[PDB]
């Protein structure tokens, strides 16, 4: 009697089912988390494809001005999108069976809500699934944490921000141009560039790419001669071999002479931990930034912070970026606002 | 020999390696970095942009910068001994000589650092992939900080070395060039996000397929020619999770070299394009359709409107030398706002 | 003691940074 109860239950039908579900012999692993994931992602995918190709225009801002997002309605790959649900609906659950017809549903942006909810569910289940297979194969279980960062980002832009703003119409559009729109408006109303968490995110992705290129170049540089000339050096490695394929000492030495001796890593485990940690933390912080700005704790405001002796404002770059922000603000959703302050 | 003695001394194993490349690198690196600190602490941008730009004036780290030269200077190299400053250091700083200083010394600094990578690689006896990978960042600096302004009117429209200033350069390129719509930039984004993805996923995978080479829960201490992690287990895992996995370590490490570097190069192509205002600004089909049909709307057209707003309002403040006067009746805007 | 040196130095650094943060609320750049 310790921690795990090591015991079985004798070739029962339900036990056979549990065995097949949790089987590590399946080409694609289908854990319990997969019992959630597969149907959700399939529904989401089907509705997404069909809508991206043939869905009628959607009244996104509830002002009876439908926006066209599908290919068969004059869009291309870059401009096509699944338009977010109507602002008249807000955060109300709008399933197909709550509409009078599929046509109404399409008009108010039901597809977006459906796809977003199903996708978030299925992706959470995807995270859980990564853990699950790690456990079934006797691995360490922290890949799903790493993947928890992107899940957090998706959850931020598809769920939390609509919650803070009171409408799924503020959720990120499922499309390229729509994404850009989301970004611009977000900058106008939260000044995300001046938010330290977004700066942390940029550090995460720039730094991530940097360390990717760095590690890659270092290991590629110190590959051990196992191949002939003009032949692919990749052939000099075989899957499953125990011998290391590159000179780690030579790489550490190079890096040591590039900057200084104590700037380099000696422990590969430490190095790869760092490689995993930097971008994941960055993205974590940016996701938090998107959600907390979803509750209007915006980026740093230095508008007219510098004054002269007489009391006149001396502009800085923050004032210029504020000018651009103003442009986006006054220009976005031209027919949606009736009152001078944009509080929603 | 004389040259041989020079080489021997320069290539000595010090705490900080020097080399011939060091002869080029260290002065220029030092001067660029120092010029940035000097400028962001003391020098203003009142006579170039009409902006406070230093700690001395009340800027913080986010709003302080070494701003671009005055538009009237054109593409002048702005030497201290140039016909513009004529030796006068004060007038030199007031003109914006620190920007060209930082840019040129930074450029030659980058050359020197790449040459350093090549030199150390050759001395140690490694393949020069670090330098190539670094050709990436160089392409970014050359295209954005040199080529783009050289294509434009003057250095004035080049990025200013500062946080909020860089932010300004960003929103400027959005509002004026529709830079997000440019496919080359999209490839760049693919490169960076893909790079961060690869970094994270490789790190996590190696960390979570580790072999038990110790008794402590601290697996760091337990680390040889033997692989410290199970490549086969990793392959199995990602094959059953994602459908496809790496099988060749060499190909893997090359791949996470290749993705981000390529990203950078592509986006650079884009930026050259913008240097000549050769933009990916519009989709003529949708503009014509929208012109004839007032009920047709996409996120593309919405972003076009956004660009127009950006351009007006900021146009008046961001380009003071133009003396742009936009009466409040001509400024584009929606209802109420 | 090395640790005492690191502690004292750290406190000094944090004090200077704190003075900068205070400077964001006073004098130039304070919107006052």
């Amino acid at each position: 009697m310790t921690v795990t109860l090591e015991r079985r239950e004798s070739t029962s039908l339900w036990e056979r089912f549990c065995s097949w579900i949790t089987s590590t012999e399946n080409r694609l692993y289908i854990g319990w988390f997969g019992v959630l994931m597969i149907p959700c992602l399939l529904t989401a995918t089907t509705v997404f494809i069909i809508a991206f190709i043939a869905a009628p225009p959607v009244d996104i801002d509830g002002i009876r001005e439908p926006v066209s997002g599908s290919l068969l309605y004059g869009n291309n790959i870059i401009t096509g999108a699944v338009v977010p649900t109507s602002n008249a609906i807000g955060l109300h659950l709008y399933p197909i069976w709550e509409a009078a017809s599929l046509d109404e549903w399409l008009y108010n942006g039901g597809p977006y809500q459906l796809v977003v909810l199903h996708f978030l569910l299925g992706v959470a289940a995807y995270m859980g699934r990564e853990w699950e297979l790690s456990y079934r194969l006797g691995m360490r279980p922290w890949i799903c944490v790493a993947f928890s960062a992107p899940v957090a980002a998706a959850t931020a832009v598809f769920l939390i921000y609509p919650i803070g703003q009171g409408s799924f119409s503020d959720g990120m559009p499922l499309g390229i141009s729509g994404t850009f729109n989301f970004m611009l408006v977000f900058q106008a109303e939260h000044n995300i560039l001046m938010h330290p968490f977004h700066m942390a995110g940029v550090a995460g992705v720039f730094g991530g790419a940097l360390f990717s290129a760095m590690h890659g170049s270092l290991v590629t540089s110190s590959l051990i001669r196992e191949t002939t000339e003009n032949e692919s050096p990749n052939y000099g490695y075989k899957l499953g071999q125990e011998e290391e394929t590159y000179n780690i000492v030579a790489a550490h030495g190079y890096f040591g002479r590039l900057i200084f001796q104590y700037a380099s890593f000696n422990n590969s485990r430490a190095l790869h931990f760092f490689l995993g940690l930097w971008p994941v933390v960055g993205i974590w912080l940016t996701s938090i930034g998107i959600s907390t700005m979803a509750f209007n704790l915006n980026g740093l405001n230095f508008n007219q912070s510098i004054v002269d002796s007489q009391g006149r404002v001396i502009n800085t770059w923050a004032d210029i970026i504020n000018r651009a922000n103003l442009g986006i603000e006054v220009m976005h959703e031209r027919n949606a606002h009736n009152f001078p302050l944009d509080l929603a | 020999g004389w040259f041989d003695l020079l080489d021997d001394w320069l290539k000595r194993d010090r705490f900080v390696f020097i080399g011939w490349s060091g002869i080029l690198l260290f002065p220029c690196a030092y001067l660029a970095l120092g010029a940035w600190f000097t400028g962001t602490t003391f020098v203003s941008s009142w006579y170039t942009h009409g902006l406070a730009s230093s700690y001395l004036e009340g800027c913080n780290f986010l709003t302080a910068a070494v701003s671009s030269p005055a538009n009237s200077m054109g593409h002048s190299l702005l030497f201290l001994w140039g016909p513009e400053a004529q030796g006068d250091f004060t007038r030199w700083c007031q003109i914006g000589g620190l920007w060209t200083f930082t840019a040129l010394h930074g450029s030659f600094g980058l050359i020197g650092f790449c040459l350093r990578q090549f030199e150390i690689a050759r001395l140690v006896g490694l393949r020069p992939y670090n330098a190539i990978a670094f050709s990436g960042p160089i392409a970014v600096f050359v295209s954005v900080f040199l080529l783009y302004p050289l294509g434009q009117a003057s250095w004035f429209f080049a990025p200013s070395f500062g946080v909020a200033a860089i932010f300004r350069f960003l929103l400027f390129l959005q509002g004026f060039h529709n830079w997000t719509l440019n496919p080359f930039h999209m490839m760049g984004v693919a490169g960076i996000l893909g790079g961060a993805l690869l970094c994270a996923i490789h790190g996590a995978t190696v960390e979570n397929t580790l072999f038990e080479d110790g008794e402590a829960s601290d697996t760091f201490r337990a680390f040889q020619s033997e692989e410290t992690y199970s490549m086969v287990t990793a392959n199995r895992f990602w094959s059953q999770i994602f459908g496809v996995a790496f099988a060749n370590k060499r190909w893997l490490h090359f791949f996470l070299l290749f993705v981000p570097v390529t990203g950078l190069w592509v986006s650079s192509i884009g930026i050259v394009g913008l240097a000549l205002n050769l933009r990916a600004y519009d989709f003529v089909s949708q503009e014509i359709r929208a012109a004839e049909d007032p009920e047709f709307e996409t996120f593309y057209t919405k972003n076009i409107l956004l660009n127009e707003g950006i351009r007006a309002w900021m146009a008046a403040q961001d380009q003071p030398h133009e003396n742009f006067v936009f009466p409040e009746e001509v400024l584009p805007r929606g209802n109420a706002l | 003691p090395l640790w005492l040196v690191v502690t004292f130095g750290g406190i000094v650094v944090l004090t200077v940074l704190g003075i900068f943060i205070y400077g964001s609320y006073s004098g130039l750049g304070s919107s006052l």
């Binding site: 004054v307 002269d308 002796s309 | 010090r14 705490f15 900080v16 020097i18 030092y30 120092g34 600190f37 602490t41 003391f42 700690y55 001395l56 | 200077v16 003075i19 900068f20 205070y22 400077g23 006073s26 004098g27 130039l28 006052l32």
Partner: peptide, 28 residues
Amino acid sequence: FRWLAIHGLAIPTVFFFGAITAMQFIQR
């Protein structure tokens, strides 16, 4: 080169730190 580099970075750093503090007390 150790002395030259370490001092090359450290000396101006202290100079600048003093300067910026002094700036913290400059009134309008």
